[PDB]
Protein backbone atom coordinates (compact mmCIF):
# COMPACT_ATOMS: atom_id res chain seq x y z
CA UNK A 1 0.00 0.00 0.00
CA UNK A 2 1.01 3.62 -0.66
CA UNK A 3 -1.15 6.40 0.96
CA UNK A 4 -4.61 7.93 0.26
CA UNK A 5 -5.42 11.55 1.17
CA UNK A 6 -8.03 14.37 0.98
CA UNK A 7 -6.95 17.31 -1.26
CA UNK A 8 -8.80 20.68 -1.29
CA UNK A 9 -8.08 22.05 -4.81
CA UNK A 10 -9.10 21.32 -8.45
CA UNK A 11 -8.83 17.89 -10.11
CA UNK A 12 -8.65 19.65 -13.50
CA UNK A 13 -5.24 21.03 -12.28
CA UNK A 14 -3.87 17.70 -10.92
CA UNK A 15 -0.19 16.88 -11.81
CA UNK A 16 -0.96 13.16 -12.42
CA UNK A 17 -3.42 14.16 -15.21
CA UNK A 18 -4.95 10.70 -14.89
CA UNK A 19 -8.44 11.78 -13.88
CA UNK A 20 -11.98 10.25 -13.84
CA UNK A 21 -15.13 11.78 -15.49
CA UNK A 22 -18.76 11.31 -14.37
CA UNK A 23 -19.95 10.01 -17.74
CA UNK A 24 -23.48 8.66 -18.14
CA UNK A 25 -23.94 5.33 -20.04
CA UNK A 26 -25.16 7.28 -23.16
CA UNK A 27 -21.69 8.96 -23.38
CA UNK A 28 -23.58 12.31 -23.30
CA UNK A 29 -21.77 14.50 -20.64
CA UNK A 30 -22.31 17.64 -18.49
CA UNK A 31 -21.03 18.88 -15.08
CA UNK A 32 -18.88 20.98 -12.67
CA UNK A 33 -15.82 18.61 -12.49
CA UNK A 34 -16.71 17.53 -16.07
CA UNK A 35 -16.69 21.18 -17.37
CA UNK A 36 -13.48 21.89 -15.39
CA UNK A 37 -11.75 18.89 -17.06
CA UNK A 38 -12.86 20.35 -20.46
CA UNK A 39 -10.85 23.54 -19.48
CA UNK A 40 -7.76 21.25 -18.99
CA UNK A 41 -8.25 18.33 -21.38
CA UNK A 42 -10.44 19.11 -24.48
CA UNK A 43 -8.25 17.15 -26.98
CA UNK A 44 -8.51 14.12 -24.72
CA UNK A 45 -12.17 12.88 -24.84
CA UNK A 46 -13.84 10.14 -27.03
CA UNK A 47 -17.38 10.28 -25.49
CA UNK A 48 -18.58 6.74 -26.35
CA UNK A 49 -21.53 4.95 -24.72
CA UNK A 50 -20.29 2.98 -21.66
CA UNK A 51 -21.75 0.09 -19.60
CA UNK A 52 -23.18 0.94 -16.13
CA UNK A 53 -20.37 0.78 -13.52
CA UNK A 54 -17.69 0.37 -16.32
CA UNK A 55 -15.20 2.71 -18.07
CA UNK A 56 -13.25 3.96 -21.18
CA UNK A 57 -9.56 4.97 -20.80
CA UNK A 58 -8.95 7.81 -23.30
CA UNK A 59 -5.59 9.12 -24.64
CA UNK A 60 -5.14 12.83 -25.51
CA UNK A 61 -2.81 15.75 -26.40
CA UNK A 62 -1.12 15.84 -22.91
CA UNK A 63 -2.59 13.11 -20.55
CA UNK A 64 -4.87 10.00 -20.37
CA UNK A 65 -8.38 10.48 -18.82
CA UNK A 66 -10.89 7.76 -17.71
CA UNK A 67 -14.58 8.11 -18.55
CA UNK A 68 -16.75 6.08 -16.13
CA UNK A 69 -20.50 5.65 -15.50
CA UNK A 70 -21.77 7.40 -12.40
CA UNK A 71 -25.45 6.21 -12.36
CA UNK A 72 -28.10 8.72 -11.19
CA UNK A 73 -28.72 7.16 -7.74
CA UNK A 74 -32.44 8.23 -7.66
CA UNK A 75 -33.04 5.61 -10.49
CA UNK A 76 -31.51 2.53 -8.77
CA UNK A 77 -32.20 0.78 -5.40
CA UNK A 78 -29.96 1.75 -2.43
CA UNK A 79 -28.41 -1.71 -1.86
CA UNK A 80 -28.23 -2.07 -5.70
CA UNK A 81 -26.83 1.42 -6.42
CA UNK A 82 -24.35 0.65 -3.54
CA UNK A 83 -23.42 -2.52 -5.47
CA UNK A 84 -22.96 -0.41 -8.64
CA UNK A 85 -20.88 2.17 -6.66
CA UNK A 86 -18.48 -0.62 -5.58
CA UNK A 87 -18.46 -1.90 -9.22
CA UNK A 88 -17.82 1.59 -10.70
CA UNK A 89 -14.74 1.96 -8.44
CA UNK A 90 -13.66 -1.76 -8.85
CA UNK A 91 -13.89 -1.62 -12.66
CA UNK A 92 -11.76 1.61 -12.40
CA UNK A 93 -9.28 -0.09 -9.96
CA UNK A 94 -8.76 -2.94 -12.53
CA UNK A 95 -7.74 -0.29 -15.13
CA UNK A 96 -5.53 1.64 -12.59
CA UNK A 97 -3.76 -1.72 -11.95
CA UNK A 98 -3.53 -2.84 -15.65
CA UNK A 99 -2.39 0.54 -17.11
CA UNK A 100 0.00 0.71 -14.04
CA UNK A 101 -1.31 4.01 -12.64
CA UNK A 102 0.84 4.02 -9.44
CA UNK A 103 -0.66 7.42 -8.48
CA UNK A 104 -4.01 8.94 -9.64
CA UNK A 105 -6.10 12.07 -9.13
CA UNK A 106 -9.50 10.51 -8.19
CA UNK A 107 -12.82 12.40 -7.64
CA UNK A 108 -16.03 11.41 -5.91
CA UNK A 109 -18.34 9.38 -8.23
CA UNK A 110 -22.19 10.06 -8.45
CA UNK A 111 -22.65 11.27 -4.82
CA UNK A 112 -24.09 14.86 -5.24
CA UNK A 113 -26.90 15.90 -7.66
CA UNK A 114 -26.28 12.53 -9.43
CA UNK A 115 -27.05 10.72 -6.14
CA UNK A 116 -30.57 10.83 -4.68
CA UNK A 117 -30.10 14.62 -5.34
CA UNK A 118 -28.31 14.61 -1.90
CA UNK A 119 -24.78 14.20 -0.63
CA UNK A 120 -23.60 10.61 0.12
CA UNK A 121 -19.84 11.49 0.35
CA UNK A 122 -18.94 9.12 3.21
CA UNK A 123 -20.70 6.09 1.56
CA UNK A 124 -18.93 6.89 -1.77
CA UNK A 125 -15.58 7.05 0.12
CA UNK A 126 -16.29 3.58 1.61
CA UNK A 127 -16.75 2.26 -1.96
CA UNK A 128 -13.66 4.16 -3.19
CA UNK A 129 -11.73 2.53 -0.32
CA UNK A 130 -13.39 -0.93 -0.88
CA UNK A 131 -12.19 -1.05 -4.50
CA UNK A 132 -8.74 0.24 -3.37
CA UNK A 133 -8.33 -2.55 -0.71
CA UNK A 134 -7.24 -4.69 -3.78
CA UNK A 135 -4.87 -1.96 -5.22
CA UNK A 136 -1.40 -0.44 -4.61
CA UNK A 137 -2.02 3.02 -6.20
CA UNK A 138 -1.61 6.40 -4.40
CA UNK A 139 -4.76 8.51 -4.18
CA UNK A 140 -5.25 12.29 -4.48
CA UNK A 141 -8.95 12.44 -3.35
CA UNK A 142 -10.32 15.93 -4.17
CA UNK A 143 -12.88 18.27 -2.53
CA UNK A 144 -14.06 21.96 -2.83
CA UNK A 145 -15.60 22.97 0.57
CA UNK A 146 -14.23 22.50 4.15
CA UNK A 147 -17.40 20.59 5.33
CA UNK A 148 -17.00 18.18 2.36
CA UNK A 149 -13.17 18.02 3.01
CA UNK A 150 -13.92 17.19 6.68
CA UNK A 151 -16.48 14.59 5.44
CA UNK A 152 -13.79 12.73 3.40
CA UNK A 153 -11.58 12.43 6.54
CA UNK A 154 -14.75 11.50 8.57
CA UNK A 155 -15.26 8.66 6.04
CA UNK A 156 -11.63 7.44 6.58
CA UNK A 157 -12.22 7.83 10.39
CA UNK A 158 -14.81 5.01 10.07
CA UNK A 159 -11.95 2.69 8.81
CA UNK A 160 -9.11 3.81 11.20
N1 LIG B 1 -12.94 20.71 -10.09
C1 LIG B 1 -13.16 19.94 -9.01
N2 LIG B 1 -12.12 19.18 -8.67
C2 LIG B 1 -12.35 18.30 -7.68
N3 LIG B 1 -13.51 18.13 -7.00
C3 LIG B 1 -14.52 18.92 -7.40
C4 LIG B 1 -14.40 19.87 -8.37
N4 LIG B 1 -15.52 20.59 -8.59
C5 LIG B 1 -16.40 19.97 -7.76
N5 LIG B 1 -15.79 18.98 -7.00
C6 LIG B 1 -16.33 18.17 -5.92
O1 LIG B 1 -17.24 17.17 -6.40
C7 LIG B 1 -18.59 17.39 -5.92
C8 LIG B 1 -19.41 18.07 -7.04
O2 LIG B 1 -19.34 17.25 -8.23
P1 LIG B 1 -19.48 17.90 -9.68
O3 LIG B 1 -18.50 18.99 -9.89
O4 LIG B 1 -20.84 18.44 -9.90
O5 LIG B 1 -19.13 16.59 -10.50
P2 LIG B 1 -19.50 16.29 -12.00
O6 LIG B 1 -18.76 15.13 -12.52
O7 LIG B 1 -19.14 17.39 -12.93
O8 LIG B 1 -21.08 16.02 -11.84
C9 LIG B 1 -21.97 16.61 -12.81
C10 LIG B 1 -23.41 16.80 -12.28
O9 LIG B 1 -23.36 17.73 -11.17
C11 LIG B 1 -23.57 19.08 -11.61
O10 LIG B 1 -22.29 19.68 -11.70
C12 LIG B 1 -24.30 19.00 -12.97
O11 LIG B 1 -25.65 19.46 -12.93
C13 LIG B 1 -24.33 17.49 -13.32
O12 LIG B 1 -25.68 16.95 -13.26
C14 LIG B 1 -18.45 18.29 -4.68
O13 LIG B 1 -18.49 17.51 -3.46
C15 LIG B 1 -17.07 18.97 -4.81
O14 LIG B 1 -16.38 18.91 -3.55
Swiss-Prot record:
In the N-terminus, the macro domain displays a mono-ADP-ribosylhydrolase activity. The central part has a zinc-binding function. The C-terminus contains two approximate repeats necessary and sufficient for formation of the nsP3/FXR complex. Residues 1-160 form the Macro domain. It comes from Venezuelan equine encephalitis virus (strain P676). Phosphorylated by host on serines and threonines. This is Non-structural protein 3. Interacts with mRNA-capping enzyme nsP1. Interacts with host DDX1. Interacts with host DDX3. Interacts (via C-terminus) with host FXR1; this interaction inhibits the formation of host stress granules on viral mRNAs and the nsp3-FXR1 complexes bind viral RNAs and probably orchestrate the assembly of viral replication complexes. Interacts (via C-terminus) with host FXR2; this interaction inhibits the formation of host stress granules on viral mRNAs and the nsp3-FXR2 complexes bind viral RNAs and probably orchestrate the assembly of viral replication complexes. It is found in: Host cytoplasmic vesicle membrane. ADP-D-ribose binds at residues 10, 24, 32, 112-114. It comes from the Viruses. Seems to be essential for minus-strand RNAs and subgenomic 26S mRNAs synthesis. Displays mono-ADP-ribosylhydrolase activity. ADP-ribosylation is a post-translational modification that controls various processes of the host cell and the virus probably needs to revert it for optimal viral replication. Binds proteins of FXR family and sequesters them into the viral RNA replication complexes thereby inhibiting the formation of host stress granules on viral mRNAs. It is a peripheral membrane protein.
